[PDB]
Design a protein around this ligand. Structure first.
Ligand SMILES: *Cc1c(COP(=O)(O)O)cnc(C)c1O
Ligand SMILES: *Cc1c(COP(=O)(O)O)cnc(C)c1O
Lengths: 468, 466
């Protein structure tokens, strides 16, 4: 492609993007396609000669879009949000042209140096302890960007089990690290995201999921019981994942109770706040963040609610030496992030994060969180006024869970019917034995009209199923 | 809060900037003259409470960011291996970042999965990989998935290998803790292997043994067989081999025709690290290094290095997708969350699709052949100067050389070059010898860029040798 033929085609892509994101409401959020739909539409081999750019651009709507789930539609309500924004897009265009790798400070200093400063910005913005900042006198920890909360949670466990094994060796210097690993046990809520179980599966660390209270919150008494029972069998408690904003119903583990136990029992305390983390930009939601000073590590996704496009996960550790001894065999003033992560290579993610924090500024990020929560409150009040439906868990943020009164099958068929037109996107979840509809406020541009429109389609589907 | 007509103008602004930057990159000091700590002083202490201007933000690119940048897109970048961008790759990711769909399951965005599957079948064919690596070959149990790095792809391969062997050892030891069984395992690579292999061992608590190489720095069948027998005798269970095609140091090739049959016979997961060299397998004449590929359980390369797709974009192929999914799940649509460490993944296949379509196989092949020709030319210039030796053969785009005599001569040549930073070079070591690695990077590298860079190097040598 000629620098001439990149200017025009670059321009045509900025126009398309501006059109696509502005008119996203006009899209069927769910694509009407079956598995394998794409193969017969694509040649069986890569083209030998250049395909014309017109043909490639023409294929965006002709073959790509019909298979897309439109995650930027206000009628997307499944999972948790993944929000893009105009600034985020502008940052990555820059980063991807540079295309530098920041494994060491030396490999591209700016890649490392912007990230350290912007991560300090973001720790402040969320009200995290000062011991999670790079540039604080007493602090010996810091923030690093990761691709997902999933890997962040794995890294915390990896750092946790490594530090404990090194400690266990000083008694048994002839024992094999893997053999010592056998004795370890890690805990989370039974509401924990599947990333916790997968971290266990990958690390070969025994994982035990602890029962929750009526608000689906893990309590200090559940952890304290488990610790005593496991130690009784000669198991070695090593790790606790506390979830601030569970996937299912957006419950909050009681951190003020879990934090002090982990500090007393010397257990690595990891905070998974993937979604709810963005809410901590607002001091009025920071209630759930009480006992944070006990956290050994904390993670949240700007890539869920804070309007940074994926990938962009914040990961803070208290002790950057324990993190780096996980990844280095060999334990100067320059920070090398390749020792803070699984891979070697990393890219210049910090630009897009920087542009978003700057382009919006703090108060507008805090107002986005409040407006999204407001739209969830409006949706809640609609559900709660209709006695066909029940809400089995409290709405703290932008997620409302509900179901038809009666058997699971009614709620199942409601989802099935909503799915036929796919004018809003919903995913069947479960708490205990009860099937629920999760309704997540996503788009920053969500209106009260969007919410009522979506509620009416749910009501229409409920009315049709309850008439069979 | 921005607005559509505001975004429109700044996109046009960012487009022109990037055309200028990539177009003029030769004019940049390749490495920056900066000290660690340098950037904090020029940033506020805290995030701005209200929106900053876009002339302010766009200004800070040349003002605050580009000073601290190593220009990886410079023809005068010759350190590590290439990480090549191109206009089609940038345009593909523009679209992907706008859609911002996650593809953890087929359902979460069908296109994100199906475009990846078909383009990964495209790429297997282009590299001349076995058909048992294709999603859509009728007799395949395997397929390709995009990952972020070769590093993580190698970790995954080792995790999949150790999990499969532990599940098997369980059959005759039902009471054995998985972690206890893992203690018996041993994995192998070349002592020329990328640090990612050592790192995968440290993460997984799997014993890693690095094996000696021949005079071409190639790992040979005899060394692996000898290791396996000595380790089996001591109660260790061989589980994994990483065979490297294009080593970091000198771009050597492990003897895959020997290693393959030993791995199949002895029950070792055979993982191929072709991070850099992989892109060469686009050209049939380099597929000699691929001999024995049929024995491989997994294969990984970085389009992200030499194929002009910007980072991140690593291809990872497995023969048995079920052994992969058993690694990642405690217990028709393909769900890529079971082929990787994390749950979430983004629409990386758009930039790959765009690159492969915008160039065609022919132009990508001409790109590889041209980088190789420029390396061959540089080689001829070094070989003609008897002050210099070439202690390992040049198969692709990397030439390694040094001054004859002690390492200080070569060290002082590198120190002399690094004063003006006009070309970025990183030293390696093969045994008792400091070497200069000279990697042909940019797809726009000409003979003049090579001769320019050679002349700086020979000048540095003339100076140091008197
Ligand atoms: C979404 C989510 C995660 C993991 O998301 P990633 O794709 O791994 O970044 C983890 N925990 C909770 C509570 C989540 O909602
Ligand atoms: C560059 C390189 C790697 C590392 O690649 P990442 O994608 O950064 O992990 C691994 N192996 C070899 C042979 C390499 O040349």
């Amino acid at each position: 492609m000629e620098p001439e033929e990149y200017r025009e085609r670059g321009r045509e892509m900025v126009d398309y993007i501006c059109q696509y994101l502005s008119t996203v409401r006009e899209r069927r959020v769910t694509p009407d396609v079956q598995p394998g739909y794409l193969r017969a539409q694509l040649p069986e081999s890569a083209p030998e000669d250049p395909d014309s750019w017109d043909s490639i651009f023409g294929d965006i709507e002709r073959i790509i879009m019909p298979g897309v789930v439109h995650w930027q539609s206000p009628h997307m309500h499944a999972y948790y949000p993944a929000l893009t924004s105009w600034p985020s897009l502008l940052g990555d265009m820059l980063a991807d042209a540079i295309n530098c790798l920041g494994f060491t400070w030396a490999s591209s200093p700016a890649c490392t140096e912007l990230e350290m400063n912007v991560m300090d910005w973001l720790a402040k913005m969320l009200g995290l302890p000062e011991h999670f900042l790079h540039h604080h006198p007493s602090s010996q920890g810091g923030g690093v960007l990761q691709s997902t909360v999933s890997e962040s949670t794995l890294i915390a466990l990896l750092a946790a089990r490594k530090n404990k094994i090194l400690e266990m060796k000083t008694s048994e210097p002839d024992a094999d690290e893997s053999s010592l690993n056998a004795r370890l046990v890690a805990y989370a809520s039974d509401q924990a995201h599947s990333s916790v179980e997968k971290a266990g599966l990958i690390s070969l660390v025994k994982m035990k999921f602890l029962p929750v209270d009526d608000n689906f919150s893990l309590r200090g008494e559940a952890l304290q019981k488990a610790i005593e029972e496991d130690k009784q069998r000669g198991l070695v408690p090593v790790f606790v994942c506390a979830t601030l904003g569970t996937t299912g119903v957006c419950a909050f583990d009681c951190l003020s109770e879990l934090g002090p136990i982990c500090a007393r029992e010397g257990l690595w305390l990891h905070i998974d706040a993937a979604y709810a983390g963005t809410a901590f930009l607002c001091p009025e939601f920071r209630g759930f963040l009480k006992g944070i000073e006990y956290a050994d590590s904390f993670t949240f996704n700007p890539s869920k609610w804070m309007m940074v496009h994926f990938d962009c996960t914040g990961f803070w550790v208290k002790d950057k030496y324990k993190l780096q001894q996980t990844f280095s065999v060999n334990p100067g003033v320059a920070t090398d992030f390749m020792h803070w992560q699984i891979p070697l290579s990393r890219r210049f993610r910090s630009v897009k994060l920087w542009f978003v924090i700057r382009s919006f500024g703090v108060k507008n990020l805090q107002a986005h969180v409040r407006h999204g929560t407001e739209m969830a409150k409006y949706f809640e009040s609609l559900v709660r006024n209709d006695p066909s439906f029940e809400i089995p868990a409290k709405r703290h943020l932008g997620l409302v869970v509900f179901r038809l009164k009666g058997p699971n099958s009614l709620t199942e068929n409601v989802l099935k019917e909503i799915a036929k037109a796919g004018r809003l996107f919903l995913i069947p979840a479960t708490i205990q034995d009860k099937l629920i509809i999760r309704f997540t406020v996503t788009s920053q541009f969500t209106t009260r009209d969007d919410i009522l429109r979506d509620w009416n389609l749910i009501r229409d589907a409920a009315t049709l199923i309850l008439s069979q």
